[PDB]
């Protein structure tokens, strides 16, 4: 159970003075690596998805991580999530667009995400039946507030999340040897999704 399982150094990372806006931009959304329907704003700190019907649209972070601890806060208003809002990571090979509404992040071998609307985990996931996260809720869905932390531990090869400062356990394992970028996939017209890189 939960925080007993945090990556090494996570408390320290979070307690330190946060990266300045320069560091946040360098690790933020990549205008050169996002859906053609997404506009990156403030040099990486957030993106806005154009109101294009029958489209799911993703973005990757500018920086891919293969070693060490990496955590960033995602801020995504609850009224701007729509039918499919997924938060996680992707390799460089994961698709960033499809032409219908779907859980695009985690629907293939190149991406891993949490459906913050339904509480399910998607990796290589096509049909119904994806697992619930976090565990230990007796099957009860945990609602995800506006802000959540995404925590990638490339020393252990895990991805996990935190709400309200509380780490919810590893969601995915077996990530070592890969180069992984912050990622989301979104369907809501004019949604604004913010990324705040915290280290390391």
């Amino acid at each position: 159970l939960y925080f007993q399982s945090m990556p090494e150094g996570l408390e320290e990372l979070l307690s330190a003075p946060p990266p300045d806006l320069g560091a946040q931009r360098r690790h933020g959304w990549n205008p050169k690596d996002c859906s053609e329907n997404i506009e990156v704003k403030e040099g990486g700190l957030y993106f806005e998805r154009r109101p294009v019907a029958q489209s799911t649209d993703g973005a990757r972070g500018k920086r891919g991580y293969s070693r060490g601890l990496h955590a960033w806060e995602i801020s995504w208003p609850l009224e701007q999530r729509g039918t499919h809002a997924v938060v996680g990571v992707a390799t460089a090979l994961a698709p960033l667009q499809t032409d219908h509404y779907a859980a695009l992040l985690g629907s293939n071998s190149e991406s891993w995400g949490w459906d913050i609307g339904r509480g399910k985990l998607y990796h290589q996931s096509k049909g119904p039946g994806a697992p619930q996260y976090p565990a230990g809720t007796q099957g009860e869905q945990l609602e995800v507030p506006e802000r959540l932390l995404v925590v990638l531990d490339m020393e252990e090869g895990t991805l996990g999340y935190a709400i309200g400062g509380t780490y919810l356990g590893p969601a995915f394992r077996g990530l070592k040897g890969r180069t992984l970028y912050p990622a989301v996939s979104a369907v809501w017209g004019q949604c604004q999704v913010r990324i705040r890189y915290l280290g390391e």
Partner: peptide, 7 residues
């Protein structure tokens, strides 16, 4: 539409 998109 359902996702605040213009059809």
């Amino acid at each position: 539409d359902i996702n605040n998109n213009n059809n």
